[PDB]
């Protein structure tokens, strides 16, 4: 099977938002609206905003999962490569095999689906704080898109779903992600190629 990637705002008007970081050669994370693609360095903070028109119920959660973008690779579980899964860089909560981690949230839970074998990380949805209009989750990608034996240069999509306490779908959004050495340069090159 393959997780759905269909955009769905749902009853709460759920959608993602990204900061405007630019494309300076030194940038560590940058999002391209034209390509709906996030470019980031290995294990660097990727701020992802959660926007809703109305607050969902207490117990609502937010899950992140990666899948290969190419249809011929969609059924393959996206996981860290043979080298990174063994580098003992766990933060004490994320299994070393997981590509996507959530930073600074002790309530993050990591799932290895007993049926699909796919990996995901989920946190409780927290409503915006005083003075804020949105909620931000900080993600880290733990392998480069080019890692051999892992993503192996194949592009991936990250699917973010808003779920109820039972795991039922409330909202869904997604974006392509490239983990690379120079996000600014690659974003500039890909947007140029699109033009």
Site for Zn ion, rule CB under 5 A: 81, 84, 143, 147, 150
Write the DSSP string, 43-105: T--EEEEEE-SSPPPTT-EEEEEEEESSGGGTTSPP---TTGGGS----SSS-TT-SEEESS-
Nearer to Zn ion by Cβ, of 28 and 49: the residue is 28
Nearer to Zn ion by Cβ, of 52 and 156: the residue is 156
Structure tokens at 93: 């909560």
182: annotated binding-site residue?
no
Smallest distance from Zn ion to CB 84, Å? 4
Please enumerate, as own/partner, the contacts of 130-133 that have beta carbons within 8 Å and a separation of 24 or more: 133/51
40: annotated binding-site residue?
no
Nearer to Zn ion by Cβ, of 38 and 179: the residue is 179
The SS3 call for residue 186 is helix
81: annotated binding-site residue?
yes
| Beta carbons of 144 and 42 less than 8 angstroms apart | yes
Bridge partner residues of 169 (DSSP): 163
Nearer to Zn ion by Cβ, of 27 and 147: the residue is 147
Answer positive or negative: Cα dihedral of 41, 142, 148, 160: negative
46: annotated binding-site residue?
no
Smallest distance from Zn ion to CB 39, Å? 17
Smallest distance from Zn ion to CB 143, Å? 3
Smallest distance from Zn ion to CB 19, Å? 25
Which residues belong to the annotated binding site? Answer: 81, 84, 143, 147
Which residue positions form the known binding site for Zn(2+)?
81, 84, 143, 147
């Amino acid at each position: 099977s393959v997780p759905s990637q269909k955009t769905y705002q749902g009853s709460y008007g759920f959608r993602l938002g990204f900061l405007h970081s630019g494309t300076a050669k030194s940038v560590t994370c940058t999002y391209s609206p034209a390509l709906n693609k996030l470019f980031c360095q290995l294990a660097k903070t990727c701020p992802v905003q959660l926007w809703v028109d109305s607050t969902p119920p207490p117990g609502t959660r937010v899950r992140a999962m990666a899948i290969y973008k190419q249809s011929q690779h969609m059924t393959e579980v996206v996981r860290r490569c043979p080298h990174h899964e063994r580098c003992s860089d766990s933060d004490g909560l994320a299994p070393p095999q997981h590509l996507i981690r959530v930073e600074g949230n002790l309530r993050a839970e990591y799932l290895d689906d007993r049926n699909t074998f796919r990996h995901s990380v989920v946190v409780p949805y927290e409503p915006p704080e005083v003075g804020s209009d949105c909620t931000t989750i900080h993600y880290n990608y733990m392998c480069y898109s080019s890692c051999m034996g892992g993503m192996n240069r194949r592009p991936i999509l990250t699917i973010i779903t808003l779920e109820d306490s039972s795991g039922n779908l409330l909202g869904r959004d997604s974006l392509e992600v490239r983990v690379c050495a120079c996000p600014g340069r690659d974003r500039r090159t890909e947007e140029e190629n699109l033009r």
